[PDB]
Each structure stands twice: as C-alpha cells, then as structure tokens.
Enzyme design. Sequence first.
Site, PDB file in Angstrom:
ATOM      1  CD  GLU A   1      -5.705 -41.347  25.518  1.00  0.00           C
ATOM      2  OE1 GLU A   1      -6.471 -40.615  26.173  1.00  0.00           O
ATOM      3  OE2 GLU A   1      -4.463 -41.409  25.702  1.00  0.00           O
TER       4      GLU A   1
ATOM      5  CG  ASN B   1      -4.400 -30.889  25.619  1.00  0.00           C
ATOM      6  OD1 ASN B   1      -3.755 -29.848  25.554  1.00  0.00           O
ATOM      7  ND2 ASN B   1      -5.159 -31.198  26.653  1.00  0.00           N
TER       8      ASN B   1
ATOM      9  CG  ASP C   1      -7.197 -34.567  26.776  1.00  0.00           C
ATOM     10  OD1 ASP C   1      -6.378 -33.725  26.363  1.00  0.00           O
ATOM     11  OD2 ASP C   1      -7.005 -35.309  27.753  1.00  0.00           O
TER      12      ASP C   1
ATOM     13  CG  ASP D   1      -3.316 -27.654  30.815  1.00  0.00           C
ATOM     14  OD1 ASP D   1      -4.488 -28.008  30.586  1.00  0.00           O
ATOM     15  OD2 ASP D   1      -2.371 -27.814  30.017  1.00  0.00           O
TER      16      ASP D   1
ATOM     17  CG  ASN E   1      -6.442 -32.083  29.948  1.00  0.00           C
ATOM     18  OD1 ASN E   1      -6.302 -31.772  28.789  1.00  0.00           O
ATOM     19  ND2 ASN E   1      -6.815 -33.280  30.288  1.00  0.00           N
TER      20      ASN E   1
ATOM     21  CB  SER F   1      -5.774 -27.898  27.604  1.00  0.00           C
ATOM     22  OG  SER F   1      -5.317 -29.013  28.343  1.00  0.00           O
TER      23      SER F   1
END
Length: 129
Positions: free
Chosen positions: A35, A59, A52, A48, A46, A50
């Site tokens: 990650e 998220n 992380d 959309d 991301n 959002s």
Amino acid sequence: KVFGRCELAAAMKRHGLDNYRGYSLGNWVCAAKFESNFNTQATNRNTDGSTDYGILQINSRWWCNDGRTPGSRNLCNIPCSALLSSDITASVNCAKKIVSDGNGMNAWVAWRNRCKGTDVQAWIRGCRL
Ligand code: NA
C-alpha cells in the site's frame, strides 16, 4: 516516517493487529509494504476524487474527513491528516474498523492482489517479536 519491516511489525503487534479478526501480523505488514512502502506520509488520489492516506492507504470516501471528498462519510471520526502521523495509532484503530466491515482484508486492493494466499509470514521472519 518510513518504517523498517521489523519496526512496523513490532508497532502493529503492540497496537493489537496480530490475529485481529483472524489476520496474522504478516498479512498487515504485507498490506503496508504494497500500500505505502511502509511510508506513513503516503497519499494517493483516486479517480472518484477521494484520496488514500498513510501506511494502510485508508480512503476519504468512507473512513476520514479531508474536506474535499463531497458526500463522503468519516466512519473513523478523524481528519485524514491523522493517518499521516509518525505514530500509527490512528491508522491501526481505523484499520480495525475497516477489517470488521464485511469483506475483511479484501478492502485493501494491494492485500487481495499481492498478499492473499502468499507466504505472508515471510514479512515478520527474522524480527524479534
Ligand atoms: Na470522508
């Protein structure tokens, strides 16, 4: 902060992740490796809108508030910046809520694709635990 492999394993064990919801410590260290490369300051935007955040790339759509993810929840009741701290407490407490959610560690794409079904114990091998 960029953790060493065994340093992170020790921190995750102290904060109660070893065998949390039946996931051995090696699963959590493997997830953090793929990650964030063990970097608490990692961020990734991301499609959309959002983002992380942190060592387990949690998220903003569901788990934290970053002030720029419209119509999102804050289920860990934290600013997303709390997930970037050198202290992993906030990331661990939020990860415990995520892994309790229904899909277990499948919530982490990097875990499903790079850790699940592999020799995850290798990630804690040689560590003084
Ligand atoms: Na949010």
